[PDB]
Amino acid sequence: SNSVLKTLSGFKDVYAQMNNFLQQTTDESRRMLKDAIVTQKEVLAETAAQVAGGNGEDELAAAIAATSDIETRIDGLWTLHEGEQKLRAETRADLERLAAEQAKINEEANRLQYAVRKDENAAKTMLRNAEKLMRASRFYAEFATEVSGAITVEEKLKVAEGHFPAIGRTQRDIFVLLPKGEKSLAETVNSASGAIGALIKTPPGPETLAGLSKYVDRFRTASFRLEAASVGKMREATQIFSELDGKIAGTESVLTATRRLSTSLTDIQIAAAAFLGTTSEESRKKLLDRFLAVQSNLTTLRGIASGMSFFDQAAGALLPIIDGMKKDGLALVEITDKRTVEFEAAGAAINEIWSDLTGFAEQQ
Amino acid sequence: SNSVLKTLSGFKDVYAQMNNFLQQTTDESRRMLKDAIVTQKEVLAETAAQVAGGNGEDELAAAIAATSDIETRIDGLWTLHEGEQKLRAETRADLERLAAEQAKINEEANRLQYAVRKDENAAKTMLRNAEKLMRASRFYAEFATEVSGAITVEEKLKVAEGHFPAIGRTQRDIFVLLPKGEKSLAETVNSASGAIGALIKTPPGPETLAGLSKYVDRFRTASFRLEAASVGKMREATQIFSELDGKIAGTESVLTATRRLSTSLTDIQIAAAAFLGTTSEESRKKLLDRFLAVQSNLTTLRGIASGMSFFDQAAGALLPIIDGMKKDGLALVEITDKRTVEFEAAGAAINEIWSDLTGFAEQQ
Ligand SMILES: [Yb+3]
Ligand SMILES: [Yb+3]
Ligand SMILES: [Yb+3]
Ligand SMILES: [Yb+3]
Ligand SMILES: [Yb+3]
Ligand SMILES: [Yb+3]
Ligand SMILES: [Yb+3]
Ligand SMILES: [Yb+3]
Ligand SMILES: [Yb+3]
Ligand SMILES: [Yb+3]
Ligand SMILES: [Yb+3]
Ligand SMILES: [Yb+3]
Ligand SMILES: [Yb+3]
Numbered sequence: 001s002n003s004v005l006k007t008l009s010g011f012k013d014v015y016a017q018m019n020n021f022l023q024q025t026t027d028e029s030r031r032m033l034k035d036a037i038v039t040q041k042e043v044l045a046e047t048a049a050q051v052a053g054g055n056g057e058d059e060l061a062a063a064i065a066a067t068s069d070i071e072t073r074i075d076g077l078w079t080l081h082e083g084e085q086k087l088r089a090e091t092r093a094d095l096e097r098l099a100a101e102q103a104k105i106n107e108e109a110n111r112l113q114y115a116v117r118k119d120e121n122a123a124k125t126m127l128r129n130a131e132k133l134m135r136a137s138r139f140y141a142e143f144a145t146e147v148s149g150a151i152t153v154e155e156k157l158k159v160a161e162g163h164f165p166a167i168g169r170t171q172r173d174i175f176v177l178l179p180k181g182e183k184s185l186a187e188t189v190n191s192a193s194g195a196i197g198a199l200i201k202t203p204p205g206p207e208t209l210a211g212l213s214k215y216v217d218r219f220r221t222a223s224f225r226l227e228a229a230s231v232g233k234m235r236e237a238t239q240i241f242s243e244l245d246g247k248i249a250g251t252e253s254v255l256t257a258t259r260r261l262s263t264s265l266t267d268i269q270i271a272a273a274a275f276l277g278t279t280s281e282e283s284r285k286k287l288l289d290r291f292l293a294v295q296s297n298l299t300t301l302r303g304i305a306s307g308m309s310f311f312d313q314a315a316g317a318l319l320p321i322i323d324g325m326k327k328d329g330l331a332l333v334e335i336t337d338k339r340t341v342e343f344e345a346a347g348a349a350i351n352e353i354w355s356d357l358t359g360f361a362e363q364q
Numbered sequence: 365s366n367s368v369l370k371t372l373s374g375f376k377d378v379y380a381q382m383n384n385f386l387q388q389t390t391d392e393s394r395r396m397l398k399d400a401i402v403t404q405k406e407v408l409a410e411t412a413a414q415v416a417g418g419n420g421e422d423e424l425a426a427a428i429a430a431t432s433d434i435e436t437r438i439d440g441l442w443t444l445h446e447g448e449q450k451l452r453a454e455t456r457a458d459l460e461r462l463a464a465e466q467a468k469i470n471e472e473a474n475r476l477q478y479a480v481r482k483d484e485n486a487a488k489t490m491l492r493n494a495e496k497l498m499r500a501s502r503f504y505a506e507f508a509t510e511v512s513g514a515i516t517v518e519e520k521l522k523v524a525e526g527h528f529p530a531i532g533r534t535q536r537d538i539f540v541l542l543p544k545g546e547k548s549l550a551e552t553v554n555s556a557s558g559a560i561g562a563l564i565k566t567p568p569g570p571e572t573l574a575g576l577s578k579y580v581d582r583f584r585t586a587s588f589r590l591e592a593a594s595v596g597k598m599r600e601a602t603q604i605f606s607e608l609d610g611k612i613a614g615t616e617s618v619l620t621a622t623r624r625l626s627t628s629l630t631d632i633q634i635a636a637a638a639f640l641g642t643t644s645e646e647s648r649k650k651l652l653d654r655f656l657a658v659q660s661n662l663t664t665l666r667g668i669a670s671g672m673s674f675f676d677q678a679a680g681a682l683l684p685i686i687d688g689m690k691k692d693g694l695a696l697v698e699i700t701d702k703r704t705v706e707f708e709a710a711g712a713a714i715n716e717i718w719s720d721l722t723g724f725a726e727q728q
């Protein structure tokens with residue numbers, strides 16, 4: 001009796017160990033449980049001293065048989081867990097690989113965005129300048145019209161005043177854009193503010209209207225010249241656009257496709273996380289979709305960016321990874337399922353044995 | 365003696381339970397261990413029957429004292445774990461909240477990208493058409509020059525042939541762009557391919573050169589008209605650009621800032637994951653950086669997009685989340701540290717007691 005106590009108590013050493021080898025699956029966990037077992041089939045052997053029923057009746061046969069059976073499966077249950085962890089380690093490693101690639105992809109998208117903007121800006125500038133001169137043309141014209149339309153010097157001076165700020169504004173806006181071949185035009189735009197200003201401050205007098213009329217006429221001349229200069233810039237803008245437009249269109253198409261790809265790469269990282277954190281076939285197939293999505297994006301890019309080195313390298317890095325992961329994911333789903341079922345039955349075995357051995361003690 | 369066996373064996377029931385309440389921290393785990401304890405201080409009480417040394421000498425005092433002490437801490441160690449899990453649940457919940465917002469942010473960035481392109485395309489089209497007419501102008505001119513420069517009908521026909529494909533190409537390219545006010549111009553561009561073609565096929569004859577000379581002259585006229593039309597389109601392009609350029613610049617600035625923000629939102633999701641998966645103060649402070657980065661991005665956007673509803677709502681949703689999480693993260697670091705230390709000492713207590721109680725058995 002004090003020996004059945006010994007067995008039941010020694011068995012509890014096994015129960016614990018096994019639970020640890022299953023809750024956890026440390027290597028020491030295993031050894032611990034394997035030692036607990038050998039010493040238990042020792043203790044359970046000394047109990048074998050007592051005999052009652054022999055072949056006709058022997059429950060403890062069941063336990064010693066069990067204990068022997070379970071001990072055989074320990075190492076295989078460890079390689080199962082040890083193998084599942086290796087697949088999960090690799091999945092994490094490959095997601096780091098993909099993240100690294102997505103980074104280069106993003107750097108490239110940025111490069112491409114910059115390159116578009118730079119090219120799109122050549123004509124933008126040309127057209128900004130075209131408008132400057134056309135605003136100057138339009139201004140000088142408004143001045144000549146409204147001043148020369150004023151009858152008295154009082155109102156001619158009034159009108160000039162209203163427009164006097166714009167005269168310097170216009171000069172600063174167009175100074176650098178001024179055709180260097182022209183020289184009187186230069187004189188007009190720069191001298192204008194001082195002259196007209198002075199006339200405004202100076203009290204109505206002899207020749208104040210002469211001077212006004214002179215600049216009303218220098219402005220009309222300038223207006224037509226600046227209009228021509230503007231159309232000069234416009235013609236430029238159209239040549240330079242037309243000659244970059246292909247390049248730009250082509251890059252916006254690549255850059256769009258790059259952003260698309262980078263997005264699907266992030267969709268992988270998300271789906272993979274769900275997979276790793278709930279490793280069913282369900283999550284596997286969701287992750288598989290995200291994979292095919294990246295595969296599309298890459299073939300799409302492959303057409304517009306065939307020969308674009310970065311894309312060649314990106315596909316060279318990406319696709320072998322995805323291929324490995326598609327298979328690795330299947331493997332992991334499987335090993336994970338085996339691990340859980342075997343770890344289930346294993347625990348079941350450690351409960352049939354307790355049930356059985358509680359038995360003998362019930363029998364006393 | 366058979367009672368010390370009872371205690372040591374009953375204690376092993378406790379050892380296991382406790383380990384489960386610590387490896388795991390299920391509610392049933394707790395109850396299990398709390399039941400294992402009450403019955404152990406029962407069994408350890410019957411052993412109290414034996415007395416040896418009394419106050420002068422009593423190790424089992426140590427165990428029964430222990431067992432009493434540990435039992436008191438169980439529930440507090442559970443609320444510690446129960447509280448740590450609540451913080452981790454909320455962290456995950458708030459990351460879902462942020463992800464949801466990042467989505468709206470991305471939809472908006474897309475909206476804005478579309479809106480730029482649409483606006484940037486008004487002038488692009490105008491300039492594409494401007495170049496079409498200027499290519500047509502240039503073509504008709506090349507034809508008049510090279511044909512009319514040819515002396516004999518043989519080479520006049522030769523030259524026309526070379527240029528004959530372009531005549532229809534040009535017609536299709538510019539047809540819709542043709543100023544409807546003009547009517548002879550219409551006649552020339554459309555009639556051209558047929559007439560010139562016919563002249564080419566028809567064998568050199570009387571009036572073949574007359575007909576050529578007629579179209580050489582209709583082409584020069586058309587050339588100057590198309591050049592004017594082109595400059596018409598150009599002028600349009602410059603007005604329409606200049607009148608959208610502010611809108612476009614402003615949107616590219618918002619869209620850039622939106623993409624920037626969305627990026628920092630992803631940086632949070634990453635840092636948070638590292639935090640959750642290694643919940644040290646170190647990872648907390650890294651996540652804190654990602655938070656401040658988002659906070660910047662939002663104030664930046666707040667200036668360019670002040671009044672942009674979507675941004676008002678985004679900041680209204682984002683910032684309270686980040687605030688909660690900054691504090692929640694501190695809390696979690698703390699509770700997590702307490703949990704681990706207390707769960708450590710708890711296990712230590714279940715080892716001093718085994719050491720002590722192994723003792724009495726050593727004493728026998
Ligand atoms: Yb060892
Ligand atoms: Yb050790
Ligand atoms: Yb753009
Ligand atoms: Yb005016
Ligand atoms: Yb005006
Ligand atoms: Yb006016
Ligand atoms: Yb007016
Ligand atoms: Yb690999
Ligand atoms: Yb059985
Ligand atoms: Yb129960
Ligand atoms: Yb139950
Ligand atoms: Yb663009
Ligand atoms: Yb030519």
Ligand SMILES: [Yb+3]
Nearest residue numbers: 503506507510
């Ligand atoms: Yb040519």
Ligand SMILES: [Yb+3]
Nearest residue numbers: 506507509510
């Ligand atoms: Yb030529």
Ligand SMILES: [Yb+3]
Nearest residue numbers: 506509510513
């Ligand atoms: Yb030539």
Ligand SMILES: [Yb+3]
Nearest residue numbers: 454457458688
């Ligand atoms: Yb909350």
Ligand SMILES: [Yb+3]
Nearest residue numbers: 426716719720
């Ligand atoms: Yb002690």
